[PDB]
């Protein structure tokens, strides 16, 4: 029944003491933190406490859209030697660092995912030609479904994959997704492998990456400009924002202290000294 926006406990007035009760003395070897409050070691006045922990609830701590990737696409002249660029991104929160670090204060999590898409475009060649307003197709390709090989091949039909057709210059696109994990929670850390190496099998055959579970965890987003080729080339970027709604988290962890180095917990030489010089008896 205690809610996140409830006020914290009042300070009760306490006077002088002389007893066998020893709140100040403890033993951290036990694994416990001493539950003390100011009235245990100093004289206090009565204060009616109004402050609350509302903004540090798990939901409120995460209640923000974070950028997780930038996808690049274009629409060139038909005469180009290089193919029309469509983008393919393997969904993850580990390409950027900020949301990753926040989620990694915890070992496991459950949440509904809100994805918001901000789309910007520009001219590249110092031309004077124009381009009519672009429509973009953001196709979700779940693990197993055919990945596009060309900006215009059959897969963009999307009979079953979810697609967003976004019109340039309109409000940024947005969809929600349920908790889609194949486990009862998302694992931010997996201390294991996806294969057991057997003795009767070759080393190559039993091998797999440390800490990786499903190779294609959540599938792909594929993005294209739906408009046909245009004389003047336009390049666009799709910025993807992830917000974890309706979230639950388990098993707290110390936050990432040295720079991220890949999708695992690995660290690079030369980045291992976060702390700065400060003298023991200097304020």
């Amino acid at each position: 029944a205690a809610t996140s926006r409830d006020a914290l406990p009042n300070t009760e007035a306490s006077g002088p003491t002389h007893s066998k009760e020893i709140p100040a003395l403890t033993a951290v070897e036990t694994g416990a933190t001493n539950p003390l409050v100011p009235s245990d070691t100093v004289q206090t006045r009565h204060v009616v406490q109004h402050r609350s922990r509302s903004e540090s609830s798990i939901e409120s701590f995460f209640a923000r859209g974070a950028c997780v990737t930038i996808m690049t696409v274009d629409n060139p002249a038909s005469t180009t030697n290089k193919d029309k660029l469509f983008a393919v991104w393997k969904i993850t929160y580990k390409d950027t660092v900020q949301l990753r670090r926040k989620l990694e204060f915890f070992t496991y999590s459950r949440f509904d995912m809100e994805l918001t898409f901000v789309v910007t475009a520009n001219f590249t060649e110092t031309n004077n030609g124009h381009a009519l307003n672009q429509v973009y197709q953001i196709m979700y390709i779940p693990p197993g479904a055919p990945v596009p090989e060309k900006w215009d091949d059959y897969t963009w039909q999307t009979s079953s994959n979810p697609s967003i057709f976004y019109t340039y210059g309109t409000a940024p696109a947005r969809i929600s997704v349920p908790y889609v994990g194949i486990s009862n929670a998302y694992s931010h850390f997996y201390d294991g492998f996806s294969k057991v190496p057997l003795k009767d099998q070759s080393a190559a055959l039993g091998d797999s990456l440390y800490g990786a579970a499903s190779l294609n965890d959540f599938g792909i987003l594929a993005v294209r400009v739906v408009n046909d080729h245009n004389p003047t080339k336009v390049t666009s970027k799709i910025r993807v924002y992830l917000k974890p709604k309706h979230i639950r988290v388990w098993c707290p962890r110390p936050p990432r202290a040295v720079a991220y180095y890949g999708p695992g917990v690995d660290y690079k030489d030369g980045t291992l000294t976060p702390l700065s010089t400060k003298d023991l008896t200097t304020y």
Binding site: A2, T3, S4, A32, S54, K245
Partner: protein, 60 residues
């Protein structure tokens, strides 16, 4: 199907309320209520088998 909840009113100019209606079948589409619960830190701050009495010796 309207949900009526109260706001915690910070700066002032009764209970002021706000209204919420869900427009979609999937709870995943819903906004966050922010009507969240708190819990005691004990599973992390006092994970010991024998209950700690802070005025008593932690070791006896």
């Amino acid at each position: 199907g309207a949900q009526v909840s109260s706001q915690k009113v910070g700066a002032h100019e009764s209970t002021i309320n706000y209204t919420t209606i869900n427009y979609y079948r999937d709870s995943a589409s819903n906004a966050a209520s922010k009507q969240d619960f708190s819990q005691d830190p004990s599973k992390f701050t006092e994970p010991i088998k024998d209950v700690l009495i802070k005025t008593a010796p932690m070791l006896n």
